[PDB]
Each structure stands twice: as structure tokens, then as C-alpha cells.
């Protein structure tokens, strides 16, 4: 990690084209010797490189995986990385070691940290949650009782409390993912926010905004603003033709409803899995990202831009069969 | 160099290149290096490929 | 710009109270903490005799008296929220009363996470050490030897993170702490011994595996019995090694105990106050044993009576118990051996004016005198009251017995419109029975809004009260819809119609709905001795704030800032909306401007163009931090209170589209109070705005020229070179902008309380400060004193 609000210079990979969320995996595939040379020195010194977002902000990444597939007389290096701290660029100079100013995380005490009665301070710790809709009222009443000392009520203060918001987000992620109830979601809100920013099918301009947000409380609200209003996902190159909606979002396996995958040639594709959608080829199985499924290309019916893939296979009564996979980069969320 | 002109695979020598070239051929060889689209002529691939995240 | 803040009314709410022998070894002193104010008394046969009052540079959080061996009298220890520690002695040279500081030091650690149950300060029985629970897992220790003048401390690690309350144990071979803590297994009580040589913990006399789920209080029972008492939700327990006792009194199942006090040093009688003002006596039935030993047979709790919602308690003498309160009036009460006709053993001896919590105010001069009064909302639950302050300060009181939310002044009817919130409970019959008759139920005329437009636990019911400005009587009480919550209220003119109207902004709070999806903006008319339903508009959200924007009703529905138009058909039409990304909670205007803000310091300056007929964003300045209130100084500057207890002042820049759209912050000041509402008015300089806080303090904020600002800022640095402080605390450190992590020196503000302390200083120091810069300064201070 880097000192908060410090200025360091970090190498940048020119092949990367993604906007990196902290706590998100960055698959790679490197052919040219210039990129491969950079990965080597990183594991020796800091193991950190920059992933510029498009050129104002970005995220640093740490190398955590490193394979070597010397095949057909050429060395194909397979590296995975995870995002660290956000930043704002100072000056890039392809010699591209970029001058970088680290952006610190803005943490805030509870809304009642100043209006809490010293007599009621000892009653601020609760017995652990039973694993209900009745319990959460007691949480609001007990922790926000001291809102009567202020001009604002209890229910309003709940919509700025990390724990209150974080549960409502988890409630929706249980519809998308049937296997998302345990320790799969960090307890710390600053990390919980970043984890949903990657897990959300949203275009790039939204992803940059959620990176510029300083407080996780704001980020959590912004992430909930998106999850409640944008029920529709459309095509970005024609806009007014809606492809699929939130109600069909499915999670095929453990890695959530949206996971990063790589094509045989080295191109990252974050494919959201759904059940049906509206608006090229025959079932092929080579390099099938989902074992037991055969991929088929799909495009839009107004602009003919790439939308994603449809996976269909036989086996037996394998669940599911008719399910799609749309790439994030070619999706635009809209408000129905 | 020494790169394939269908699946866009890169090889170190021109020998292993021509060893691979006579393997796609099926009245639709030009495969998109991003979405696996099947094209007939190189003029089709050059357009669609640049209509893709790049 | 540069501003000037001065305290108009000292804080009234009491957050601390302890007995002891501070002034004279034989006198019985009652020390009282009113936030930043320390009141010293002497307990006479009648009541309290004022002795001294001092102001510390820091909100007092921990206050304890202790008498080390070989000391004239008891000494005082005070720890602030800024982690300022000090030892205080009394010194009376004939008639000059002085409070010298024997030792002073700051104990803030660079690292550390403030604990969930706040700061806890405890002192060893034998005055050997001072334990301070500042952060989770860290136990700071100040050793009590008379060579520790700087209070250098050493920390110890605590394997327990979620500790609730901790006391020093009584009657032990070594300084022993006892505390209740929580781990995933449950809630436990554990003890440690404290070694000063090893500077670590040793094994504790005992350890009890389990305790009550919501155990909150730890009381150290003195030498006669020993051990410690643990009070929780419905169980009171006693622990001391092999000795264990537990009781489940049904009389304390209704509420939760939050404050206590020891009556006699024997520990046999204990006072217990809860959250609803109730008073309890905890009795330790000691059994005289056959060989000079004394055991403990049973435990008992009896209902004494009912006081003001108690923050702290303290028995004085002859049944006189001081009841300190943060919501209602501090009380001195007498206890009676005999149960009166009702059942209470308590009769009110005295009352102390407590303005806090001030949740709303409005500047008026009902006498038409051209001077300025102040009618505020005060208290909560039964402690609800209005307090009219004049000019000392004449503080009237109008008990309401329920929570006053909002207030405004109407003049065409010469009355006041007041929003109120009373708490009710579900009965088996199927109603919402009230706890006590209050201003809502005890009114002359009732009015339940029917509307029907949207067709045993606590439930809130909001009401609108009309109160004549002379008798302050309950004229009319309007009951809003079942499950409706009123938010804002204003009295103004609707453009051309001379009819003055009462307008209330409401919501529709349900537990299943986390966001407000409905609401109402209701207009009312009080003239014919009754309230009139002058049409209500159905919106789709909460109506947080409302302002009169020149003949047009400005409303805020969630994020949509929206102008409403009073039509000639006695109804409201939507003119134009300025949609926003943040929740439009705050809303203030200044002619044609609009100042929108949310709970997270998101200042957003709009501008209404009359020819365009719509609002247009002019600037913004987001800086995520908890904002309590915000007001408009003038067309350029803006003022608000944020974070802990600070005050900020942003303004507009002096060529770029991105630089004229970035509001620059210029004023940073740590006021010391939590400001809930600003109000314009008063009771050279320009602009007079007053504010009401939770601790009852009222202060005035005014502007200054650059000449006076540069001069007053020069005086402040010189003033703090002769003026003696209480705990030897630098003033700049106290006024510095303090959050929970950010710590920056103050700038853009001038402390009026420090300026008006030049008149109370002597001549040798009056002329020492003004050197290289006497009557000239007197004239300046005199003029400012009028504010
Ligand atoms: N066989 C080819 C050939 C070229 C490009 C791609 C594939 C291919 O399979 N995928 C994806 C999508 C389909 C899939 O299941 N896995 C992949 O790696 C490509 O982008
Ligand atoms: Zn399209
Ligand atoms: Zn090929
Ligand atoms: Zn393609």
C-alpha cells in the first residue's frame, strides 16, 4: 500500500483499457516483451502498477497471480491483479511512469457521535443480529433515539447510516445471487462499497463517478440509487432499444452475476448473466467460459453492435439451459 | 510479425505460421479477435473489429 | 468575509454532577458541569449557595473528585472531548477565589479508535492512578505521584474490544478494575489487577463467565460489602468472587437504567434513574453476622417517584437529591419517608431553567418595541416547553408535556403555530393511548385531518398547535393523519391574497418503506378562532423544508427543489422544478438566491432568473461531513455548523466557469455546541444571526470589516498571554477545527467571548497587551458588548 495523500511515481501498462475498482480482479494476457518485462520488475520491488481511467483519476493494482505459457515459440504470460488505492494523476510521461497523487479515504463517525447523551453512551452496543423486519426497527429506535435532540427525525438519519444501507443492498444481491448470504460481503463499509461498484452492470461514466466519491456512506447511497431506479439495461450505441432488465439478472455460479473473463486472444469481457432479453453463428464450445454450455454471438437489431453471447448446451436436465451473457462495455443502464 | 490473418494468432517463425494457416478454411475463416464473429473477407473483419472495445 | 461569534446565553443543560469536599475540607460541595461551564456550590441546610463559575476551553466529559493522602482537601480531575487532562485545586486568598491547576496534560494518541460507549474516566479508591478508556483495546494509565506534573502515561493492551463500562473495585489488595464486555460468545464481566512496576495487567481476583445480554452499568460497592453491582435491562446482579446475587424486579422492566448515585458511603442505598425520568432506590439488605463480618442477604428496588428525565443524580443531605437533566429542567427534590397519597416519595424543591435542546426558534418583538425577543422550542417528551428570552435574561416558560418540533410567528392573528410530536402506545382495545394528558389532548378545540387521500409498541403522532402570543394558551391542536410526520412549517404571504396562511410540510413514514414515497403540503388558516383546511397538495415524498420565495411557495420534495404557485382558485400549481442528485433537506433564500444542502455538507447554490422563469445552478461545493444547520450570511457568504462542534463559512470566488462554480471556504471555527437552527434578528458591524443549540446555549454571529478583523485577531493572540486559563489550555487549540480525524487551526472567525474578557482584566494587563499596536480599545469593546 501507499501512504495516504502521498505523491509517488508508478509505472503504467499501455495495454490496459479498463477502469479499475478497488478490490476487483484484473485478468491479463501479455504477448509483447515490453509488458512482460514490467511484470518481472514489479514482483521484485513494489508489485504495484497504475490502471489509468479514461485521464483524470484511476486505481493502483497489485500483482497476485503470474503464469507462464511458452507455447508456439512465443511466451504468453497470464497475470491477475487486484485494485488498491484511488488517485489523481499529476503528470504522465512515456519515457510511462506517471506522477500520481494518492487519494485518501474519507471516514466519518456515526451520525449520532456528537448528539449522543453521555448517559445513553453505554446502551449503544447491541446483541448480535438474529439470523427479520422487526429487529431492524429496534436498531433504528435504539441507535437513533438521540435524534429527538436534533431538528431531524430517526428514519431520515437511517438513510445516512452505513449499516442500515448496507443491509438493504445485500437484500437485493440475494435475488441476483442465490449463494450470496455469508462472509462473501466485507463488514467494513469502505470495502463493501467498492465490491458492489464492480458487481454492478453500469457504464463507464457511472463507474468514474463512484470512484470520485469520497465517503463510503455517499457511495453506498449512490450505489443504492442505481440499483433502485435503473431497472432497464440497453445498448449503448443505439440507446433507445432496451436489451434486458434487472428482474432477469442471474448468478450462474459462485463468482456472482458479473465476473471477468478472457478470450483466447487477450481481451477482458465482464459478462452479466441473465435469463432472457429482447433485440450470429451456431453453438460453439471451444474455450467455453461456462463448462457445459455452448456460446453463440449476439448483436443488436438497430445498430448491429456487439451485445454478448448466448450459451446453450445439452448434457441432461442441467440448470440452466436458456441463459445469456452480455458484456458490460456494450451495455447502458436506463430508467424505465 | 509472423502473425496469422484469420484468428490473429501470433507465431515466432514463418514456418509455424504456414503450419497453422491451413487449418481454419471453411468458407468463413476470419474470426473476430474479440467476440468470435465469423467473417468471409478481410474487409468485413477490419470494420467490425474497430466497432469493438478498442 | 470575516465574522464574529459571541455567546448570548450560557449553556443550560447539565451533563455532570458530583459531590465532595473541594472548597473547604468541612464544606459539602456540589460541582456541576454545564457542557463547557463548571458551577461550584456549597450545600447548606436550605439548598445550594453559589460559589464560583468558570469556563474551560473544552467540553467537559469526565469530572471526578478525589482526595490523595496528605492533602488539604479534595482535588478535581477534568477530561475534555479534546483529551485535555488537568488536576485542579481551590485557592482563596481572603476574598479572591482562584482555581489553580496542579497538573495539566494532553493524552490524545495519534492512533486509536474511539470506543462505542464513549470516554470513561475512573480513579483508584486509594488515589493511586487515573484510568482512562479512550480507545478500544487501550487502557491509558496516569500514575498519581506528586512528580507527575505533565501527566505522562503508559498504555496497556486489552484483549477485550467491546467493553461497556468499567470501574475501580473497592476493598482489594491491589488496584483492581472491573468491567462488562461483549464477545461473539455473549456478554461477560471480568477483572484485572494493575501493576505499576510491570506496567501491565495481572490476574484478577475473579471472573464470571456470563452476565445479562444488555448489561450497561457497573457500580463499585464500597468496603462494607465489596464487589460490584451490574444493572441491565431487567436484571440487577452482584458479583464478588464466590458471592453472587440476582434479582428480576418487574418494576424496572418498563425502561432502562442509565444513571446512578451512592447515597451513604456504606453502599446500602443506591439511587437509580432511567430514560423516562423515573427514580429508583436500590437497597442492599446487609445481614449482620456473628463475628464482626457483614454479608449480603438480598437485593431490593423501590419506586421513589418521578423527576425530570435524569442525566446525572446525586444525593446531598437530609433527603435532598439533585437531578441533572439534558432535556428538561434540572431539579432539586426532597425525599419523604412516608408514601404520599399518590405514591411518590418525591416533591419538587426547585427548578433550573433548561433551554436545551433548542430545536427551533423565531425572532419576534411581540411588544412592537423594536428590541427583539426569542420564542424557541425546548425539551423532549414531557420536558417539551417554549422559552421566551428577553433582556441578565428574562426566560419565561410554557410547559407543553410533549415534544415541540417547529415554531413560527403569525401576526395577522397574533399567535404562534407550533408542530408537536406526542408518543402513544397500542392497547388491546385497538387504539393509541397517550402516556399523560398533554397539550395535544388537553386542548379546547380538536381537529383530526380526514383527507383520506391515501386510502403494544411506541408510535409517533404529529400535531399542529396554535398558541396565542399573550396567554400562551393551547388554542387549537390539529391532529395530522395516522402515520403522518410533519417536517417543516412557515407563516408568510401567498403573493396577492392578503390572507395569511399556515403551511405545514409533512411526509408518510412507514417502517417497510425506507424512502419517503408520499407526503403532503397542507395550507391552514387561523382567523375565526379555528383552523381551516385551505386545500392540501399530494406530493410523492417528504417535504423537508419550505420558504417564502417572493409570492411563490418554495418546497423541497426529497431531491426535487420545486416552486409552487398560489392560484386565484385557492389551490397550488407546480411552476418549475430544479431536480438534484442530493436530498434537498435544507433550503434558505436571500432574495433571488436559493441555498440547498443535504445532511452531508453538500452545499449547492442555485439562482432563480425571473425572465427565464426557472432555477439554474450557479455553483456547488461538496465536502462529505455531517452538517447540522446552515444559514445565509449575505449574498456572497454562507454559514453552517458541521462535524463535531464546528462552524464553517463558505463564499463565492472573485473568471473561469469552473472557478466561479466552486464555492471557496474561508471561515473555520470550533464553536463547542451542536447548532440545530439559525435565525435572523437581534435583541459598525453588519448582520445579526442567532442560533440555538442542544445544550441550551444561544450565540450571535456578526460580520466585521478587514480592519477590525485584523485588529481583533491581533488582540486575541495578545489577550491569551495574560489571561489565565482553567486547565492551562491554549485557546487556539480549543477553537481549532476538530472532527474525529482532521485537526486544523482556526481561521476566519473571532471569539467574542475572548474579546469581551478585556473589560474584566486589570490595568497592568490592559496596558501590556496594547503595547506596540488604552482608552482606544475600551471604546471598541464597549460598542461590541451591545451585541
Ligand atoms: N473461439 C474464439 C475465437 C476468437 C474469439 C473468441 C473465441 C471465444 O470463445 N471467445 C469467448 C466468448 C465465448 C466463450 O465461451 N469464451 C471466450 O473466451 C472469444 O472472445
Ligand atoms: Zn444497439
Ligand atoms: Zn489462425
Ligand atoms: Zn467482434
Residue numbers in the entry:
A (entry chain A): 72 to 125, 133 to 173, 178 to 213, 220 to 367, 371 to 427
B (entry chain C): 381 to 434
C (entry chain B): 2 to 392, 709 to 772, 783 to 981, 984 to 1012, 1023 to 1112, 1126 to 1139
Provide text from the study.
The design of highly selective low-molecular weight glues (MGs) that cause the degradation of a specific protein and exclude others is an area of significant interest in the drug discovery process. Both globular proteins and C2H2 zinc-finger based transcription factors that contain a beta-turn are known to form complexes in the presence of MGs known as immunomodulatory imide drugs (IMiDs) that bind to CRBN, leading to ubiquitination and proteosome-mediated degradation. MGs can recruit or degrade more than one target; for example, pomalidomide (POM) and CC-220 recruit and degrade transcription factor IKZF1 along with SALL4 and several other targets. SALL4 degradation is linked to developmental abnormalities and avoiding off-target degradation is desireable.
Furthermore, the addition of C-terminal residues PQVKA to SALL4 ZF2 results in increased degradation relative to ZF2 alone. The affinity of ZF1-2(370–454) is 52-fold more potent than ZF1-2(379–432), likely due to the inclusion of the PQVKA residues that resulted in more potent affinity for ZF2(405–437). For ZF1-2(370–454), C-terminal residues P433 and portions of Q434 are visible in the X-ray structure, and P433 interacts with CRBN S420. A model of the interaction of ZF2 residues P433 and Q434 suggests additional contacts with CRBN residues M88, S420, V128, Q129, and Y355 and these interactions may be responsible for the increased potency observed for ZF2(405–437) and ZF1-2(370–454) relative to ZF1-2(379–432) and ZF2(405–432), which lack these residues. The C-terminal residues P433 and Q434 likely contribute significantly to this interaction; ZF2(405–437) is 68-fold more potent than ZF2(405–432) alone, and these residues are visible in the CRBN:POM:ZF1-2(370–454) structure. Overall, these findings are consistent with engagement of both SALL4 ZF1 and ZF2 with CRBN:MG complexes as well as the previously reported involvement of C-terminal ZF2 extension PQVKA.
